[PDB]
Amino acid sequence: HTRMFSVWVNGVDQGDGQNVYIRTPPNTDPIKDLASPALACNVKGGEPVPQFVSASAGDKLTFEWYRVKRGDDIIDPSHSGPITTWIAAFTSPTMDGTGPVWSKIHEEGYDASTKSWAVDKLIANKGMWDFTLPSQLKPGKYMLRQEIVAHHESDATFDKNPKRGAQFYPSCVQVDVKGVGGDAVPDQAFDFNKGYKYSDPGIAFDMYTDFDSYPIPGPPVWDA
Numbered sequence: 691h692t693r694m695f696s697v698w699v700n701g702v703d704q705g706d707g708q709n710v711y712i713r714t715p716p717n718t719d720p721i722k723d724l725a726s727p728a729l730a731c732n733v734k735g736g737e738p739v740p741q742f743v744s745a746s747a748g749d750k751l752t753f754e755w756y757r758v759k760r761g762d763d764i765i766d767p768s769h770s771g772p773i774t775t776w777i778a779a780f781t782s783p784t785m786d787g788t789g790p791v792w793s794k795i796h797e798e799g800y801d802a803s804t805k806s807w808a809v810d811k812l813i814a815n816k817g818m819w820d821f822t823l824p825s826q827l828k829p830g831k832y833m834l835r836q837e838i839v840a841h842h843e844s845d846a847t848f849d850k851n852p853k854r855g856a857q858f859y860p861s862c863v864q865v866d867v868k869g870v871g872g873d874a875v876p877d878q879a880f881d882f883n884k885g886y887k888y889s890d891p892g893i894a895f896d897m898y899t900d901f902d903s904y905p906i907p908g909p910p911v912w913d914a
């Protein structure tokens with residue numbers, strides 16, 4: 691259990707984002723049903739918030755996460771798994787992030803050298819998660835989506851044991867991308883309800899064995 695507090699732009703906190711520029715769900719509960727409309731932007735994903743983060747293409751962004759209170763333990767260390775970041779054009783305000791619209795822009799999963807997960811790193815860096823807005827990206831509004839997947843109970847699938855299964859923690863942020871950017875339009879058009887399946891070995895994943903690597907679900911990072 692976890693959710694986002696604010697976004698930082700080149701190391702500058704834009705201030706509490708919850709129901710401002712983040713589509714903040716009412717609590718920290720996980721999505722587990724891969725058929726749920728909420729898989730994409732969580733439980734209030736379809737409700738506009740009034741603001742957009744201001745950034746230029748190429749800018750470094752930091753997503754800041756918390757569990758109960760800002761600056762706390764962030765998420766339970768049991769909750770090992772990867773952290774992926776996505777982009778989609780802002781089609782209309784009542785978009786909810788369903789359909790074939792997403793391109794993946796960053797991922798960290800399992801680092802075998804350190805035996806460290808993305809989540810272990812999120813914790814040790816106090817809920818701060820960094821990535822870059824592609825410098826080639828075309829100026830305009832987009833939704834960013836960033837997702838912690840936790841695998842403490844991914845050793846079964848939800849469809850077989852509803853009391854278990856992988857847990858998805860998606861956060862969608864509204865961003866007005868300015869500066870020069872380039873001509874890149876995100877064009878992987880990945881659909882989460884279609885594209886995440888119980889058969890994916892990055893979902894049906896047993897973290898309680900001697901494993902050497904973790905296959906992160908979805909396409910590779912957008913070639914930009």
Ligand SMILES: OC[C@H]1O[C@@H](O[C@H]2[C@H](O)[C@@H](O)[C@H](O[C@H]3[C@H](O)[C@@H](O)[C@H](O[C@H]4[C@H](O)[C@@H](O)[C@H](O[C@H]5[C@H](O)[C@@H](O)[C@H](O[C@H]6[C@H](O)[C@@H](O)[C@H](O)O[C@@H]6CO)O[C@@H]5CO)O[C@@H]4CO)O[C@@H]3CO)O[C@@H]2CO)[C@H](O)[C@@H](O)[C@@H]1O
Nearest residue numbers: 691692716717718719757758765766768769842843845898
């Ligand atoms: O399978 C074989 C292997 O098993 C391993 O053991 C595993 C085991 O399999 C697995 O089932 C187990 O799972 C437990 C997790 O480890 C543990 O983290 C999890 O704790 C949850 C807890 O269930 C939940 O209630 C709690 O909810 C909080 C939430 O954190 C918090 O954000 C929210 O806060 C709200 C405030 O209260 C409110 O004031 C404010 O306004 O809103 C906030 C939210 O917006 O409150 C809720 C409820 O109070 O979250 C915690 C986690 O943070 O429990 C799981 C059990 O169901 O893990 C085991 C390992 O750890 C063996 O280890 C291995 O040997 C075997 O091979």
Ligand SMILES: [Cu+2]
Nearest residue numbers: 691692766769
């Ligand atoms: Cu949890």
